Design a protein around this ligand. Sequence first.
Ligand SMILES: NC(=O)c1ccc[n+]([C@H]2O[C@@H](COP(=O)(O)OP(=O)(O)OC[C@@H]3O[C@H](n4ccc(N)nc4=O)[C@H](O)[C@@H]3O)[C@@H](O)[C@H]2O)c1
Ligand SMILES: NC(=O)c1ccc[n+]([C@H]2O[C@@H](COP(=O)(O)OP(=O)(O)OC[C@@H]3O[C@H](n4ccc(N)nc4=O)[C@H](O)[C@@H]3O)[C@@H](O)[C@H]2O)c1
Lengths: 374, 381
Amino acid sequence: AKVLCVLYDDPVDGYPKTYARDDLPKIDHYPGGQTLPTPKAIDFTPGQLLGSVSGELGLRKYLESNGHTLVVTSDKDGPDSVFERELVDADVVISQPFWPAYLTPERIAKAKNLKLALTAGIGSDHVDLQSAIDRNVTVAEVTYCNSISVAEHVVMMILSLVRNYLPSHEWARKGGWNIADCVSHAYDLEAMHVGTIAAGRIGLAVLRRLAPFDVHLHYTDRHRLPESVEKELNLTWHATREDMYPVCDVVTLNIPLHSPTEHMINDETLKLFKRGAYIVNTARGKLCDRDAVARALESGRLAGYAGDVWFPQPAPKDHPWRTMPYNGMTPHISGTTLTAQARYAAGTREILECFFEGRPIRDEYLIVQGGALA
Amino acid sequence: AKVLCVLYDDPVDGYPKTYARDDLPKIDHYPGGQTLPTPKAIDFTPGQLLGSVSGELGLRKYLESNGHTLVVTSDKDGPDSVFERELVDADVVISQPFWPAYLTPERIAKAKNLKLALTAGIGSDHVDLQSAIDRNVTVAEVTYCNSISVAEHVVMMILSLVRNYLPSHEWARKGGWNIADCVSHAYDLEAMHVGTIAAGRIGLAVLRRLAPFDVHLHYTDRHRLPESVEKELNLTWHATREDMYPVCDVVTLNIPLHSPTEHMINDETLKLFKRGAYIVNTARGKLCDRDAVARALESGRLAGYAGDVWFPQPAPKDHPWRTMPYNGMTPHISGTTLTAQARYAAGTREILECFFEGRPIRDEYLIVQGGALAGTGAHNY
Ligand SMILES: NC(=O)c1ccc[n+]([C@H]2O[C@@H](COP(=O)(O)OP(=O)(O)OC[C@@H]3O[C@H](n4ccc(N)nc4=O)[C@H](O)[C@@H]3O)[C@@H](O)[C@H]2O)c1
Ligand SMILES: NC(=O)c1ccc[n+]([C@H]2O[C@@H](COP(=O)(O)OP(=O)(O)OC[C@@H]3O[C@H](n4ccc(N)nc4=O)[C@H](O)[C@@H]3O)[C@@H](O)[C@H]2O)c1
C-alpha cells in the first residue's frame, strides 16, 4: 500500500543530530485510565524530532519492510502541492493538525485509493467527515496524545500574562533593569477568578493544575461535569458562556470551533469582560475575531492575550497578533512537544499496524469507520 | 518623628496614570493561617505602584498628618548618598529588598536616632542584626507578603523553560513560524522529577502548585516537613543537596544565601545534575557561580536556567545570564508585583501604627526587638 505522510519542515539549521536530554519521563496512562499507545514495536527513541519531514514519524522502516511505500513531504497547500499530485493513488494519508493536509470533498474525490485518513495528533477538522462517510474512508486520531501538553501550555501562558513575564524578560535580555517598568503591569494569579469555556480533556486538565494556585474556578460546557468533580475542584458552573465572562479575571478557551463558536469573542461580546481580563486561546484562532482582540488590547480593555492558534495558519508575516500590546503568542506548537510527538508517532504506528493486519483499531481512536461516525 | 524611605525608580514614561484593572482579589490569610496585614486604614487603592519613589508606599498623608517627616529617595549607595545624609537623625528606616538601603554597623552607628528598621518585603540581610541588637533598634519585615508571588514566578518559569516558551514567542514576534525550531527543545513537564532545595514558605507553595502537574516531587531542607505533608504531596526526602540533584529533571532553589550556601551551584556540583536538567532560582543570585551556570548552558549540561535574582545586583548590562542560551531571566521583580506591594505597603503602615501608638508589633513581623533576636528572627536562629 502507498502511505502519503505530510509533516512540517526540519529546523532551518537542519535536522538535529543531538538533543537536550537522553530520554522522556515514563508515563503509563492518561487521566481516566486510557493507556498510552501500544504498537507492536517502535523504530525511534522517544524524544527524537518525529513530526518534521526528516523524522517521518518513525515509520519508514516499518512500512517498507512490509512492502508499503512512504512518501513524505511538507508541500501540502493548493492543487499544485506535492501532496495533491501524490494523493490520487494514496491508500493512507497522514498529517498533523500543526501542519495539516486538508482532505476537502474535491480532494477526497481525486483520491481513488483512499482507505485511511490518519491524524497524527488530535482533531480532524482538516478532513471532510461526510465525504469520508460516503466513501467508506476510516478516519482515526491518536486520542489524548497531547491533551496534557496543551493544558501545560495554557497554565504557562496564564501565569506569564498575569505576571507580565514576556516584557520583563525583554528588559533583562536587552540589558535593562527597570523594576517599575516590569511590575506596573504585573499581578499575582492567586485568588483571581478563572474560567474555561469547555471542560473536556484539555479544560479539565487545566482546571486541576490551576486549583492549588487558589484561584476561583468557573466553567461552562454543553454537558455539565459530575457533581463529584465539581465538588473536588470547587467549580462554579455557568449555563452559558456569556454568563461566565463578566465574573472572570481570566478566561481560557478549550472549546471546539464550529458554527456557534466562530467569532464568539468579538467587539460586542468583549464588552462583557471585566476591565483588565486575560484571554488564553489554545483552541482555534477563529474563536476570536482577530481585530477585536487587537483593539481590546490597544485600548486597554484586555490586559493580555496569549495562545498558539491563529487565523489563518500559518500566520502571515504581518498578522496583528504578533505585535499587539501584551500578547504571549507562540506559533502552533503546544501539542507537538517532543514528548507529545513520541506518543502520537507510536499511536500512528499502532493504528497502521491494526489497519494493515485487519485487527480493530481502538474504539477511542476512531472518528469515522464503516460509513458512519464511530 | 522622621521616617526615611528608600524606593526604586518610577517607570521610564513616568508614574502611571492608569492601571490594567480596578482592584485586587480578596484574600483572607496566608497558607498556615497568618492573616494578611491589618492597618487601621490605608491611604491608597490596592493595585497602585507603591514601591517606586512616587508611590511612597502610600505613607505621606498618614505620617505628615500626624506630625511626622517623610523623606523618600532612591539614592541609597555610598556615604554621600541622600540616604546616608538623612540617616543621622531618622527615627525609622524603610526599604525593600528590591532596592535595599543597607544598615551597616558604621551606618547604624551614624544613625543617632534610629529606633525601627522596617523591611517593606521579606529579607533583612541588608540590616546588620548584631548592631541592631546592641543599639536596641527594632528590626521588622512584612512576613509572607510575597511568598506566593515568588512561588507563582517559579512554576511559570519551570513551565517556560521546559516547554521552550521564550524562543517560541520570539519566533512569533519576529514574523516566523518555524515549528520544528520551536519544538526541537520543547518537552512536557508531566512526570518529570522536580525538586526544591528548601521547603519553606516559597518552596512548599511551589511544591503544592507542582502537584497536579503529575511530576514526581523531591525536596531537601535543614528540617524535614511533617510526615503528613510528605504523605499528602508524595514527597521524596533527600538528606543532602548533592543527593537530590542527580535524580531531578528540574531543581528550584528556595534556600537563603549565607556562607554555607554561597556558590552551592558550581562547576563541581553541576557535574551531579542530569544532562539537560533545568534550574530555577528566585532565591539569591550568588547561590550560583555565575560562570559555572553560563558554562553549563553553552555545553548543554543544563537545558535551561531562569530566575529573577543576580550577582551583582542590579546586573551589569553585559551580565552573561541576560543572553546565554536557553535562559528565562527577568530583573529582580517576582516579589514586587502590584499585588505584593499592596500587602507590604499595608503591612508597613500597620507596623508604623503599632510603633507610634505604643501597641506591640505582631510577633511574626519581628526579627529583632528589645535587644535580642526576636519573633520570626529568633525562629530562623
Ligand atoms: N495544539 C493545540 O492548540 C491543540 C492541541 C490538541 C487539541 N486541540 C483541540 O482540542 C479541542 C478542545 O480541547 P479538547 O479537550 O481536546 O476537546 P474535547 O476533549 O473533545 O472536549 C471539549 C468539549 O467542549 C465541547 N463543546 C462543544 C461545542 C459547544 N458548543 N460547547 C461545548 O462545550 C464538549 O462539551 C466537550 O467538553 C480544540 O478546541 C482544540 O483545543 C488543540
Ligand atoms: N523576589 C525574590 O526573588 C524573593 C522574594 C522574597 C523572598 N525571597 C527569598 O525567599 C528566600 C527563600 O525563602 P522563603 O521561602 O522566603 O522562606 P523561608 O524562611 O526562607 O524557608 C526556607 C528555609 O530553608 C532553610 N534552610 C536554610 C539554610 C540552610 N543552610 N538550609 C536550609 O534548608 C530552612 O530550613 C527553611 O525551611 C530567599 O532565599 C529568597 O528566595 C526571594
